[PDB]
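Researcher: Good morning. I'm working through a list of sequences from a screen, and I'd like to move beyond sequence-only analysis. For each chain I'm collecting a predicted structure so we can compare shapes side by side. This is the next one on the list. No need for commentary yet; just the structure.
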Amino acid sequence: SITAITVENLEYPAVVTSPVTGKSYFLGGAGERGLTIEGNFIKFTAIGVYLEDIAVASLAAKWKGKSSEELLETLDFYRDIISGPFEKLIRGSKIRELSGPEYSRKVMENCVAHLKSVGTYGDAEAEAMQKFAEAFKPVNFPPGASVFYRQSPDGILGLSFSPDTSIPEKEAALIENKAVSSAVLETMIGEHAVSPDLKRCLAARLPALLNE
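Model: Good morning. C-alpha cells for this chain:
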C-alpha cells in the first residue's frame, strides 16, 4: 500500500528484505545529497531510509493520529525513528562515481561531529570510526553502486557494499558500538540535519501506516 521512490533514475523499492537478518523493511523516505559549488548544487548520491515492518507497532503508541505537519515539526518523532526498538536500513546509491575513501570522508565527519556534540566520543567511538573508515578503503562506487547501513537496535552497525543496487548477502564489516551505530542515521534525519527531504518523506508517509 506504500509507494516506491525514484531519485535521479535510481529506484527505491517500496519494500525490501535483508539477506543478512531476514527482516523486512518498508521505505520511509528517499532523497539526494551532494555539494554546493558556488551557489550551484551538484548531486552525487541518492539516499533511502527503510524501517523494519514492526516499527509501525512501536511508533503507533505516540504518533498514531498525528498530522504530517505535526510530525514534521516534532523532534521527538524523529528521535523515536532513530533510536526506535527496531532495525533501520539505509541505502546510498551513487549518481557520480566516488571512491570508498572519497564518499566516507564526509559522512564520517558528520558522525564525529554529532558524537563529540552529544558528549559520546571516547576512545571506543574513535576506534569504531577508524574501523568504519577502514571498511571503505578497499571499495569503489561507480554510478548505480550502493552502500548499505544496517542499524541494529542492538547497538551494532552493519556495513555492506553492492556493485549495483541490490542488497548483498554478506556484510563487509560489523561496527559494534552503540553511539556510532545510530550516528549515521542521526546525520540524515536528526535535529542538526541539513537537508529536510528525508524528514519530510517520513512525516508524509508514516501517518497512513500508523492508522491501520
